[PDB]
Write a protein that binds this ligand. Structure first.
Ligand SMILES: CC(=O)N[C@@H](CC(N)=O)C(=O)NCC#CBr
Ligand SMILES: [Cl-]
Length: 130
């Protein structure tokens, strides 16, 4: 229905705003664009589902997220990809892990404070009805 389409549009506006707030944070610059294959030729071979915030915006606009849970799965990938690709004890890898964990924690904290649970439940029930 049109009411359902209005629900999903509101979801996309909410998700674009959360993603923009993460993307303008200087800590998260490395996560704003795909990894450049030049600098990192082994990336695309180790990490089977690369994800970054530009890809998340593209997904929102392609109507790929019908619930906040689906969006958080991709935020979780940005975090877990960095834990997997940069697991060493040296400071460069520790800094990327701490930034990727902080992204994830920040997205979850904004959603805890600003997503109404009944709005998410509605999205879940429309998605399940399709
Ligand atoms: C290269 C690397 O090992 N670290 C990555 C972090 C990552 N897990 O995507 C990085 O900082 N951005 C890509 C580049 C380059 Br230069
Ligand atoms: Cl830096």
């Amino acid at each position: 229905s049109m009411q359902e389409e209005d629900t999903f549009r509101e979801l996309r506006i909410f998700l674009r705003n959360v993603t923009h707030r993460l993307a303008i944070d200087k800590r998260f610059r490395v996560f704003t664009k795909p990894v450049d294959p030049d600098e990192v030729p082994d990336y695309v071979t180790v990490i089977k589902q690369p994800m970054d915030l530009s890809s998340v915006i593209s997904k929102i606009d392609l109507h790929k997220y019908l619930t906040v849970k689906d969006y958080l799965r991709d935020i979780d990938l940005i975090c877990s990809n960095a834990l997997e690709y940069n697991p060493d004890r040296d400071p460069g890898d520790r800094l990327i892990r701490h930034r990727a964990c902080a992204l994830r924690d920040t997205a979850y904290a904004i959603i805890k404070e600003e997503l109404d649970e009944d709005f998410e439940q509605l999205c879940e029930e429309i998605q399940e009805s399709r």
